[model samples]
Target chain A: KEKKVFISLVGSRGLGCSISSGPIQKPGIFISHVKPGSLSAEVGLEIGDQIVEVNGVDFSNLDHKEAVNVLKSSRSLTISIVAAAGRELFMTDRERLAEARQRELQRQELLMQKRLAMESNKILQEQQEMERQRRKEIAQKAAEENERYRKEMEQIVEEEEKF
Target chain B: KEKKVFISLVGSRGLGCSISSGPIQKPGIFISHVKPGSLSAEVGLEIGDQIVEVNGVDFSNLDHKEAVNVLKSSRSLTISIVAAAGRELFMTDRERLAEARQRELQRQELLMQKRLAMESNKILQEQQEMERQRRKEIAQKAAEENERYRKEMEQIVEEEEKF
Candidate 1:
């Protein structure tokens, strides 16, 4: 009976929602207002919905100011809420967080794969370079040997002609 | 200098580029063709550019088929290349990889902070619940004592009057 929503603050106006808290003795941070056509309204946030979490921070124990600060500072927010009517079958905060962790893990795995691939490629490149150098050296040695043989035969021919 | 270019294949027709390799004895994968007005053309992929890397995999040692497979399989490609003319100053694959790593690191850090904040808030919420329960119990005990005193006083007055 909870909902998790992702909101991006980058290149957007303000949150377009006002937050308020219950009595200090029985505290709760809740949405007090959502402006029409605002980001909050578009995201389905409404008045009287209790804000359970922002980003990854729990709103359960935050005072008004602390909660505001957390919301304001984050460039992107993953918010969890409880509807005032106590209805709705949406993903819970824990489930959403788990999904995020899973996504991040996959991303890291991909990066690792990429890194390993690059390293392996570098090794191959080095081996190829070495092979090329070795072949070049062999060719040079063979050419030198051929030149020496040619000069020796030419000298033999000159000596035979002199005889 | 080497160049790195990112190409997204999502919703695209295809890579719109053909690959070819030099002789097997001196192998190197290079772009052989780029379709006009295609993704490759839009991304500035030129014909004759040697394919150095594809999605972090080394093209240095890959045969034509291997290189093509690597490029085709990736949904999003981060390609590193050496220009045919050996001209251009662009971010190398290593530098691009480093930048990606840095961005990922920052994202993880934010997640960690959010997790810690949520944990701390949970502790505070528990403490507040305990305090509320303690207060409720104390109030109930005080009310019980007052009720007992009132009944005792009423019984004593009745006994005295009867005597």
Candidate 2:
């Protein structure tokens, strides 16, 4: 039984991948490379897999270009393959450098935002507090005047009753 | 010693490749797959090469999308990398049924052309012989006519002398 993997590459712009095979050196169709984040990689197709068939057609009986033709023509592709020589491959010397300019640009943006907020802080504070004080004074004066008027009216009622 | 390989993939849509990195599995920017005949493959950048830089900028500290961004903006890309694996890599399972099919097609085509050429052989032979015979007859007739003209001239000359 052959293990089959189905991969779909959306916005593929025509599959966006490549395959190669040599009759003298290799015996079956081999996938050479897959684009990152493409349908090819998303489907877990390794670098070098001997393609057995596509859509039930035995592509092991076909050349590299003919195998690729099958993929291009079909609306959906069903591929059967096995991992080849490059499986479990070795690697070394993988170090890389940071993009310093990008970090500095972000730093500058944050500083500008802080400066603008600081400049407007004092002006907004003074205007808002002044409005609050004016309202509070009006309320307190009105309460005091109402209280004195009520006391005077009560004294008049008591004096008239005595007369 | 630094061996820098510069490559450019124009209209790349994206980097069109995948990377893997880890101490236990694979180290550095491991190119797991490359699209065949892509800018990656076109530049002799094979699978399993460690990527060091892009566009004169070091990308060792960059993420996947960051690296893709660099590729998108730059006009000409200068990729510095080294072969970590596949230096001694060989081929297998590349050529098989296709070679047989190609030869069979060529053989059939050649046979058809030969058969068609052979069908016209008899007609061509007869036509060639007929033309040759016609030329020989015309040449003999011309010689006989010249002989008659010479005799008539001689007779006229003899009459004039006798007179």
Candidate 1 chain A worst ten-residue window by lDDT: A83-92
What is the C-alpha lDDT profile of model 2 across B74-95, one tens digit per residue?
A: 6577777767552222223444
Give a tens-digit lDDT track for model 1, residues A15-87: 7988877765546888877889888888999877888998888898788899999888878888899876321
lDDT of 2 by residue, A61-96 (tens): 587678777888676788888766432221123311
User: What is the fnat score of candidate 2?
Assistant: 0.00
lDDT of 2 at A133: 54
DockQ agreement of candidate 2 with the native complex:
0.00
Specify the CAPRI tier of model 2. Answer: incorrect
Per-residue lDDT, model 1, residue A139, is 51
Assess each model's interface with DockQ, reporting 2 decimals per model: 0.00, 0.00
